[PDB]
Design a protein around this ligand. Structure first.
Ligand code: HEM
Ligand SMILES: O=C(Nc1ccccc1Cl)Nc1cc(C(F)(F)F)ccc1-n1ccnc1
Length: 462
């Protein structure tokens, strides 16, 4: 069509596109598979079309450095729009250009290491809540789905970190916080809706004026009113909360708005609910099929934390083998699967012309399983990140949280929240592969990096 000849005139390889659709039909196996194939059959740089949108994939570590870090503020500043957002336009992950830079500057102190030390005790409380619910699940003698026990833990952590709501989600699934935020799941960009707007981006403004938001409107309105209630109730009571830290910044760039505060509060829930639980389920599955790693980690946890001691910020950063298990699992399963930046101007990077409007993509999943930089990439060898071998890895081929000024702002929080859970559960429980567990676990063919079947494992007291 009009823009389907852009990659041919630049001498860039890629799958031949079909009219009105581009290469969306090649998504029959999902983004992860499709990127790995195009890597094998085209080399280091290739291109494809999401409808009429040209997407350029780069794998050179220097080019990834230029896009994500070097020329970030100048050229590659924003991600591609993904649908009708409504008032959630002010979310930091959705904000663009000057709005994003202000929001990140006014929200960066919220994710300091010092503020994280102050949040460890609160996250610790629901680690003990997790084992109690896990004790009953283990005594039943039946396999346990890890997605639900971790989702309950992640929900409990989010409600206590973002707000002052202290709830046991597993046994109290009736609080309006628990019910509405339970629907804040990841986006399957290969479902009929997101596929349709990817081929029909012209329908996004139509959806917006219909007040059709990508997020559930009932959940957003409830959470906005809840913050309005809490903001008044916190004043009447006159704290360690993502909200309170934002309140303590609003009263003292230019400023942060009341609606902006609500928007960022919801995005923290959206960025943390399933992502933490999904990675936690992935981590425990890999420990069950490789008990040697599970044994050494359990021994290391007992060494740093004798007599089932409670974890502390400093002790968590001390445990090395736990950091190795988390990193290697993220290498096998980068749940973002991709990193995207929009080229706002005509620019040349590392001797390559990038015309304005092209979406530049970094295939995180494809790079993390590339035989070039990784040895036996299909295996779970957590020793790759040993202190001696933790330098050979290129920090721009392994990008689980992204890189540059637009990386995951909650990387330290997520890593601490995940590790705090892993210490408590492993030092009390051991996990064995039940029959229903798929030993060669298969990944889903949709837009999410999730297993084909929910991971079920046998759990027992230690
Ligand atoms: C283990 C779970 C998580 C993983 C694997 C993950 C990964 C990522 C990735 C790959 C990005 C895109 C970075 C890039 O484009 O350069 C991102 C962005 C972001 N994440 Fe996370 N994330 C996780 C959890 C969280 C949590 C719990 C929070 C909230 C406390 C959070 C807050 C954010 C924000 C605010 C951004 C956008 C930052 C920006 O646009 O400037 N993430 N994350
Ligand atoms: O852009 C993303 N990539 C991603 C990261 C982790 C897991 C899965 C994915 Cl696909 N995720 C994202 C998107 C939004 C937006 F929909 F508002 F754009 C808001 C928050 C996050 N997010 C999740 C975890 N950390 C950040």
């Amino acid at each position: 069509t009009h823009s389907h000849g852009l990659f041919k005139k630049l001498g860039i390889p890629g799958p031949t596109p079909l009219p009105f659709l581009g290469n969306i039909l090649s998504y029959h196996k999902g983004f992860c598979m499709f990127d790995m194939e195009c890597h094998k059959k085209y080399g280091k740089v290739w291109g494809f079309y999401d409808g009429q949108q040209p997407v350029l994939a780069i794998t050179d570590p220097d080019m990834i450095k230029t896009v994500l870090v070097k020329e970030c503020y100048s050229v590659f500043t924003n991600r591609r729009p993904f649908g009708p957002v409504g008032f959630m336009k002010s979310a930091i992950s959705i904000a663009e250009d000057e709005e994003w830079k202000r929001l990140r500057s006014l929200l960066s102190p919220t994710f300091t290491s010092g503020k994280l030390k102050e949040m460890v005790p609160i996250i610790a409380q629901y680690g003990d809540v997790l084992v109690r619910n896990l004790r009953r699940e283990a005594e039943t003698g039946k396999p346990v789905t890890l997605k639900d026990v971790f989702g309950a833990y992640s929900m409990d952590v989010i409600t206590s970190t973002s707000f002052g709501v202290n709830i046991d989600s597993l046994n109290n699934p009736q609080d309006p916080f628990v019910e509405n935020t339970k629907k804040l799941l990841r986006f399957d960009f290969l479902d009929p809706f997101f596929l349709s707007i990817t081929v029909f981006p012209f329908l996004i403004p139509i959806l917006e004026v219909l007040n059709i938001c990508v997020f559930p409107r009932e959940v957003t309105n409830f959470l906005r009113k809840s913050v309005k209630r809490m903001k008044e109730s916190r004043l009447e009571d006159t704290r360690v909360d993502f909200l309170q830290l934002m309140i303590d910044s609003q009263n003292s760039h230019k400023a942060l708005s009341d609606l902006e505060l609500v928007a960022q509060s919801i995005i923290f829930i959206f960025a943390g609910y399933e992502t933490t639980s999904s990675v936690l389920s992935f981590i425990m599955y890999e420990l069950a099929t490789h008990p040697d790693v599970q044994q050494k980690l359990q021994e290391e946890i007992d060494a740093v934390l004798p007599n089932k001691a409670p974890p502390t910020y400093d002790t968590v950063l001390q445990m090395e083998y736990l950091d190795m298990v988390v990193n290697e699992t993220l290498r096998l399963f980068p749940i973002a699967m991709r990193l995207e930046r929009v080229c706002k101007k005509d620019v040349e990077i590392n001797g390559m012309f990038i015309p304005k409007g092209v979406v530049v993509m970094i295939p995180s999943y494809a790079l993390h399983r590339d035989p070039k930089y990784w040895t036996e990439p299909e295996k779970f060898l957590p020793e790759r990140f040993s202190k001696k071998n933790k330098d050979n890895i290129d920090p721009y081929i392994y990008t689980p949280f992204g890189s540059g000024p637009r990386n995951c702002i909650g990387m330290r929080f997520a890593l601490m929240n995940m590790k705090l859970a892993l210490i408590r559960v492993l030092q009390n429980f051991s996990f064995k592969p039940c029959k229903e567990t798929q030993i060669p676990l298969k990944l889903s063919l949709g837009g999410l990096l999730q297993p084909e079947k929910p991971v079920v494992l046998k759990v027992e007291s230690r």
